[PDB]
Amino acid sequence: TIPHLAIDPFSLDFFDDPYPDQQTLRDAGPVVYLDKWNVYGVARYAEVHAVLNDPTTFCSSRGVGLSDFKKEKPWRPPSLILEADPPAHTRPRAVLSKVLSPATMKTIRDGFAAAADAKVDELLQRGCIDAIADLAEAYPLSVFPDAMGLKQEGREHLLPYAGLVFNAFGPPNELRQTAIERSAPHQAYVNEQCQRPNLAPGGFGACIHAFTDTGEITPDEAPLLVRSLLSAGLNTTVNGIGAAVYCLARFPGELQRLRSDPTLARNAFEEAVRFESPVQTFFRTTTREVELGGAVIGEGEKVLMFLGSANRDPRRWSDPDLYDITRKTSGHVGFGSGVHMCVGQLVARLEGEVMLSALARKVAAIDIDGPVKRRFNNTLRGLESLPVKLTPA
Numbered sequence: 254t255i256p257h258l259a260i261d262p263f264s265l266d267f268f269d270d271p272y273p274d275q276q277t278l279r280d281a282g283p284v285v286y287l288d289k290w291n292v293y294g295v296a297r298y299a300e301v302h303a304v305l306n307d308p309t310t311f312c313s314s315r316g317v318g319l320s321d322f323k324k325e326k327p328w329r330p331p332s333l334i335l336e337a338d339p340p341a342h343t344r345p346r347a348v349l350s351k352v353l354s355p356a357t358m359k360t361i362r363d364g365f366a367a368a369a370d371a372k373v374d375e376l377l378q379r380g381c382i383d384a385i386a387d388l389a390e391a392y393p394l395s396v397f398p399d400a401m402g403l404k405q406e407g408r409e410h411l412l413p414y415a416g417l418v419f420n421a422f423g424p425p426n427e428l429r430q431t432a433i434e435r436s437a438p439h440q441a442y443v444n445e446q447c448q449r450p451n452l453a454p455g456g457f458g459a460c461i462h463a464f465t466d467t468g469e470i471t472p473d474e475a476p477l478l479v480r481s482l483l484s485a486g487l488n489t490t491v492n493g494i495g496a497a498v499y500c501l502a503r504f505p506g507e508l509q510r511l512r513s514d515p516t517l518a519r520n521a522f523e524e525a526v527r528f529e530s531p532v533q534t535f536f537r538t539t540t541r542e543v544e545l546g547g548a549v550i551g552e553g554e555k556v557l558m559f560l561g562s563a564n565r566d567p568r569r570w571s572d573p574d575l576y577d578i579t580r581k582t583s584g585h586v587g588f589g590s591g592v593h594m595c596v597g598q599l600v601a602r603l604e605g606e607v608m609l610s611a612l613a614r615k616v617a618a619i620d621i622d623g624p625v626k627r628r629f630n631n632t633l634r635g636l637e638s639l640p641v642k643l644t645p646a
């Protein structure tokens with residue numbers, strides 16, 4: 254019925270090259286059992302999409318990591334949005350949607366673009382750079398904390414904290430254990446910046462606190478919602494932009510197409526999100542007994558969704574393992590799908606678009622120039638170091 258596999262999707266070997274194991278997971282059946290961690294897994298697009306779009310059956314309030322909040326204490330107070338189900342999810346979600354609205358994008362777009370162009374100009378003066386530290390990390394650090402309204406002091410905690418959050422979604426392996434044992438100072442920093450007086454006027458955080466009188470959220474909910482943005486809003490974009498740059502360096506043909514038409518920048522970013530899937534996995538917990546892909550799952554079972562695999566499922570995509578910047582990407586699940594689909598995706602896409610636009614206009618070649626170094630995280634896929642040589646247009 255359901256096949257049992259011994260594959261550990263949280264092992265370093267798996268992280269180093271997940272694609273053959275993801276095929277094995279897909280081809281074993283629509284629903285698999287992972288004996289290593291005692292969870293169900295779905296690795297094909299169809300079942301992942303299905304699970305994403307029925308939150309009643311496959312809930313989030315019992316945690317979207319391995320841990321079941323009904324059995325264990327969460328390592329930090331539950332997110333009011335990610336780890337909430339409707340209807341408790343609905344109004345905080347509505348608040349964050351307005352804080353990160355089309356109108357908000359319109360106010361910051363010029364500034365986000367200028368900073369991207371400035372970044373690429375600065376890098377071109379150096380020629381040989383690390384596309385991670387100097388670009389993928391540097392550019393979001395140059396725009397997102399300011400957009401949040403964070404003070405300057407203590408920003409060095411942001412990436413450590415977010416790494417910790419995504420490691421903590423995983424099983425209790427070494428990556429997770431080590432993360433939590435180092436957490437205290439990053440946690441203390443982030444929690445403190447979530448308080449209203451610590452967030453600059455007009456910024457994302459201040460706007461969340463400004464939203465505490467409409468009947469949607471109360472003032473005591475606002476700090477945790479600022480926490481959500483400080484959890485998900487930086488490192489994801491770093492890995493997104495890094496993915497895109499990695500793709501353009503590996504596929505020079507696509508760089509040349511992008512150069513010839515920079516209006517393809519937004520879709521080039523979208524395709525990179527599909528192709529590399531920064532957020533690889535999330536869990537759901539069953540709230541009742543349910544039929545899924547000919548399998549019957551009992552109540553209170555963890556279900557692991559392979560978003561990255563779903564994005565490379567040949568049942569859904571033609572040539573899924575090719576990077577194609579004119580692909581019809583609509584429908585990929587790199588930002589999820591359904592009621593929890595990434596609420597900050599407009600920010601992510603804005604950052605990616607203007608960075609790729611800047612590269613499209615300013616850079617003639619991106620050539621890998623040193624050993625590439627992958628970074629391991631229980632949930633995030635991305636590189637630690639990507640030495641490249643940039644050649645100006």
Ligand code: HEM
Nearest residue numbers: 334335485486489490493587588589593595596597600601
């Ligand atoms: C390339 C960049 C990003 C990727 C790949 C990504 C990925 C995701 C995914 C897959 C989900 C679905 C979670 C689920 O179904 O349980 C999600 C939700 C979420 N993301 Fe993003 N994200 C990105 C950028 C951002 C940014 C820039 C922000 C904030 C500024 C953000 C904040 C959030 C929040 C608050 C949620 C919870 C939504 C909800 O539960 O309703 N993310 N993200």
Ligand SMILES: COc1ccc(C(=O)O)cc1
Nearest residue numbers: 332334335480481484485
């Ligand atoms: C996409 O990953 C995350 C991480 C944290 C949160 C949150 O803290 O609410 C939401 C999404």
Ligand SMILES: [Cl-]
Nearest residue numbers: 329330440444
């Ligand atoms: Cl925390």
